[PDB]
Amino acid sequence: GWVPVTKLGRLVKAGKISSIEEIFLHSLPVKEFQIIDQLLPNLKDEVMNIKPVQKQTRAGQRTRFKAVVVVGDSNGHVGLGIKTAKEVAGAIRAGIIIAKLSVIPIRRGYWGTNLGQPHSLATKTSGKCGSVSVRLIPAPRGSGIVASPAVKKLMQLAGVEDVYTSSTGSTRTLENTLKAAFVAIGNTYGFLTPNLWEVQALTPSPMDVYADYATAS
Amino acid sequence: MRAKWRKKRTRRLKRKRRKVRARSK
Amino acid sequence: VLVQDLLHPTAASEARKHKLKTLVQSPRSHFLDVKCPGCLNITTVFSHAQTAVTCESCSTVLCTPTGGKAKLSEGTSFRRK
Amino acid sequence: GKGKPRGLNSARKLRVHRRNNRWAETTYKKRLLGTAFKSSPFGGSSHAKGIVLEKIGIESKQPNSAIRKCVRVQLIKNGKKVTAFVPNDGCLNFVD
Amino acid sequence: SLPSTFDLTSEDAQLLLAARVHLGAKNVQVHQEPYVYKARPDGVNVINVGKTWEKIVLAARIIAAIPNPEDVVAISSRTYGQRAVLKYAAHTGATPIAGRFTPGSFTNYITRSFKEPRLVIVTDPRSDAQAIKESSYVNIPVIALTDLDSPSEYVDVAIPCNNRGKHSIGLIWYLLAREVLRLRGALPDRTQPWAIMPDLYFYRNP
Amino acid sequence: PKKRASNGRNKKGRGHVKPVRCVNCSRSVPKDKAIKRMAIRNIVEAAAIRDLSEASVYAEYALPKTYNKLHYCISCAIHARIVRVRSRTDRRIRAPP
Amino acid sequence: MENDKGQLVELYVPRKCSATNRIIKAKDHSSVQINIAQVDEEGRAIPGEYVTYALSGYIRARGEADDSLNRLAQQDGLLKNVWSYSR
Amino acid sequence: GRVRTKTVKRASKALIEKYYPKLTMDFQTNKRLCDEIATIQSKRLRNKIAGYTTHLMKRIQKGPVRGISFKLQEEERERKDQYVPDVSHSNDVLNVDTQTAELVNSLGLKLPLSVSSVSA
Amino acid sequence: GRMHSKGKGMSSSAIPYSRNAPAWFKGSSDGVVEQIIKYARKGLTPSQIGVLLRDAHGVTQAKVITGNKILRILKSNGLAPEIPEDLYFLIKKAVSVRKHLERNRKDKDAKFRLILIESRIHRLARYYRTVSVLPPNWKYESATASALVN
Amino acid sequence: TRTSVLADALNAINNAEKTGKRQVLIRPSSKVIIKFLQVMQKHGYIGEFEYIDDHRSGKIVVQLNGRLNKCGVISPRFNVKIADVEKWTANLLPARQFGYVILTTSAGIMDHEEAHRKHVSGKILGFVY
RNA sequence: AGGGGAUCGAAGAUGAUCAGAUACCGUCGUAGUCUUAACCAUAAACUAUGCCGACUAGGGAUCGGGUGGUGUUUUUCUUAUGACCCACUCGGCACCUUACGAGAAAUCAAAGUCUUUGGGUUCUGGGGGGAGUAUGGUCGCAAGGCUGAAACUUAAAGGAAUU
Ligand SMILES: [Mg+2]
Ligand SMILES: [Mg+2]
Ligand SMILES: [Mg+2]
Ligand SMILES: [Mg+2]
Ligand SMILES: [Mg+2]
Ligand SMILES: [Mg+2]
Ligand SMILES: [Zn+2]
Ligand SMILES: [Zn+2]
């Protein structure tokens, strides 16, 4: 079973968008889950941690399960889903879905000089969530992922080979750390390099081209 | 215990100590 | 906001804004060239005073100094600059 | 700019400030004052020999309950009466 | 780029003046507003008529870009415009949301009233603000009828206008509809006010 | 933290103000952490007015009202006066209707 | 950007906003593509061909966006008189 | 305490949406219609639904109600509209202001003017 | 932002963009110079002289009209005071405050203000010493200050 | 006290860029500021800019490209010794690759690359990445 | 150390209340509360926000000054003034919205312009107790203040929110 709500979903089903790069170009909302699955079949999805989370009542307590889910490949798209449901497997599934919806690109770059294929980041760039500042820093070839476990896993999922990290603040709250890392990754595609002064065309969106095939009959 | 009260008691103790010292002298 | 082609604004904006905070600062104080009911002579008198200002030789008193702009002595005609 | 003169001929003030600040860090203070030699039973050494004066079962701290089979030991070098715990399954059958 | 016949024709200007579009606008101000040609003694600012008309034209030229007719969505909560909005919708393609907006409608792809627009037109950023805010989430430009007293938050092209009420709002709607029809539609000529009447709109039986 | 930005209020560019004494408690209280209510009561009661009108001399009579600015000190004003207590979102209100 | 001997890498080449040159980000759930129709005499609104802008989320969020759009219009000749250099 | 429940009301609404014709005002016929079209595992419930539908019908005679306007109720509002021939010319020729006149001076060609004053 | 209070004023005399003479405003330079010298002779102090010039006569700033300053002009003609004008005024103020204090034994605020005045004087004194206008190792305070005034 | 003027100049510029102003007004404006701006221009970070000859101190109006990200001036002017340069660039700039550390030298206010090429360095002023 | 000693009122009485109350409440009541000489230097001395400086976002208000109004209004003719009124404008005391920034959060136009870390400068802090103690200096007529430890000792003590 598939069945699309939203124009974009319909478009994807018709098979007129080839890869998510185009989607990213026009910053399109991807509220429908299946789209990412369709476009990226290469999705390696990892569970991080499932801390029980409590809520107090007149009798007993509510034990929900907050599960941090990463999603990725080696291409430079990463997901991060956080979900809090009562059933643990169900929660994990939901988290996966969320991560798939989220999935974001990375400007993988060069350590120093071009040589062959980018497996680092462009710029020393950081996030901060709650009070956890993950900085990441373009490490040179082969110098590996230099990160705390969670962050390291995230980097692996991304398809970064080489990264220094300065994770600061209370990184022991894993969720927050992960969020910060994700934010930092998102930021990559924001720092205007001089490789970016060059003027673009501004394409008419898939929404404004394949307009007739979109929307319900 | 109130901090003010504690301070007062400390002061009293100090005074007592001073008195003792004076006596010794 | 965002774009305000800075160097040349309207005269109105300049008039409104504090006469120190503009681009090229110029005083917005005049020289009243004042005539008295006595003699047929004009005196170059600053728009502000700080002094009770008598004429070229006559004890006529042109302007009484208030906080700012000088309030002229009852009925005296005056030019500008 | 916050505290510290981001100055350039500033340096003596910085250095002195650092010195003054350091004392609040415990380890450094201990090293400098020389707490190791004046106090803390051992002569700042790792190990010390002493003499089993009297075996005492010290009654343990809260949640936990038991008796803890320690020894009041008089050290040779300083002459200080400590209480040294003894590990494992009795072994006072060894201590005497 | 410019039709040059698309200057504000006298009849249209008269209409606008009658509506008091420009000659409303309360004495208060939002700092992002240079559509104001002088100010009146007591309680009134005056809106550069020509500029407003040009912006309306621009807005139409934006509604003319979207190929799907019922993809451009109009929205009004306040009563002084619901009827006008409906009329606009009838005239053009356009889906209308008159009255209670449905907070989260462009997000929440599960609602019984799921509209996904590519353009949204709004009466009041003071009342319908919720809709505008929602638009931010899913990326929709917001064409709106600004009273020069209301915020410009999340607004791409805003027709400067009066929103005291009555004949202004409705008139503006009518004008916009007319312009849209002119730019790809049935009504072909520059001149003639046509059967498209301004009073098809406005506020009727209260 | 601060329950209010203003606190017990009105001491802004004012150093340390003068103290007004309470009506009920006769506790001293600052003129800001004050709670002052203006009671413009009729010098008589509503059921006492009719009787007065029936018996009294002079053409109907204007009848005076008394004027008392009563300073109910903070605490005593929570023996139901002004004050009432409010929600975190209800406390951002500077109007009484 | 380019891997030594030509060969372009770095996909998803960011849209930049037309008003601010600030990069339109990947999850710019705030930004917009504005499309304005190239127009001709009697009816005629010329389908297919638009003068297009992108406005980044941030400016819009700030509020000052309408004026920026006006500015853009006045440059590409989609308006005259509406927005002036000096305010 | 005879407040009709959510469910009954919802059912009635649905019925009105899908079958606004064939709801002949009075109870008895309407009840039978409800029994026919809607599948109710009960009798009392069906009756209740019928009653609510009748009430709705009665209401919809005396105006439009919120959540109750579906195509055939729409066309009795959309077409039953449009006054028209009074316009915005009437009450002398073009009543304007001083500022308005000034504005006109800069932009438009030649327009009729009736200038007022406006003061404190 | 004000040498002694918490106040942060920006009332100030501005200046015109032109260093050149204001065209129509006639007279000469020599006449202006003469006027200045006359004023100096009469016992007025630089600022006062300038004020007198500006309002009654056709003067904007002597620098614009003559070329040289007021103070410089005074120095050239040898009529300038021994203790710089501002400093002298400060000293006078201090003296006044001291006198007041002599009378009123309990007037803490006045004393405090006097302290500030003294501090200001000291600053000024130092700077005069540096630029060599007060002969070095001359300190200006309480006992001798009064004598200095007049 | 407006102690350092370059700092002031950069701060306002930075603020403007953050908001999305296309233009800034810099109050005091020196030789040094102008030189810095010229350097920035040479590598295309700043647009046109106009120094008003105030018959006083100065005033600079800048045109922003939106190509600026952060322009920083470092607090004391650390004297910097040709190898120190590398360290500074590693710390202060977003890549071993692009952007510039704007150090004043005896040969003039250059960026860092230029200085390295020229083989001369001195005190640091700012940076532009 | 003098005066003045109305009111209130540490102490004390003294009545209740209470298992008990030299606590809360009632009634007296020195010291003190005024004040002149001196001292003492502390306070939740709080905006719990070091001082300078620059910049970024609007908004009305309000106090202080200052121009711009054929503006109203007082009439003793034209008035000239004041008091308003409208538009500004510096300076302040604050406040309301938004955050596009912060921040842990509460919140904040500053607590902003800080991992994209660098305007100038003081001072203070380093888990909690021990302890603002002990000792030593000192400055106090004393009460005390400024400075100010460690031994021990414990896995928390804290904040800000949520259920
Ligand atoms: Mg004050
Ligand atoms: Mg008793
Ligand atoms: Mg007692
Ligand atoms: Mg203290
Ligand atoms: Mg404090
Ligand atoms: Mg400690
Ligand atoms: Zn004269
Ligand atoms: Zn009370």
Residue numbers in the entry:
A (entry chain C): 39 to 255
B (entry chain h): 1 to 25
C (entry chain b): 2 to 82
D (entry chain X): 2 to 97
E (entry chain A): 2 to 207
F (entry chain a): 2 to 98
G (entry chain V): 1 to 87
H (entry chain R): 2 to 89, 95 to 126
Quote the original article.
During eukaryotic translation initiation, initiator tRNA does not insert fully into the P decoding site on the 40S ribosomal subunit. This conformation (POUT) is compatible with scanning mRNA for the AUG start codon. Base pairing with AUG is thought to promote isomerization to a more stable conformation (PIN) that arrests scanning and promotes dissociation of eIF1 from the 40S subunit. The factors eIF1, eIF1A, and eIF3 bind to the 40S ribosomal subunit and promote recruitment of Met-tRNAi in a ternary complex (TC) with the GTP-bound form of eIF2, a heterotrimeric GTPase, along with the GTPase-activating protein (GAP) eIF5, to assemble the 43S preinitiation complex (PIC).
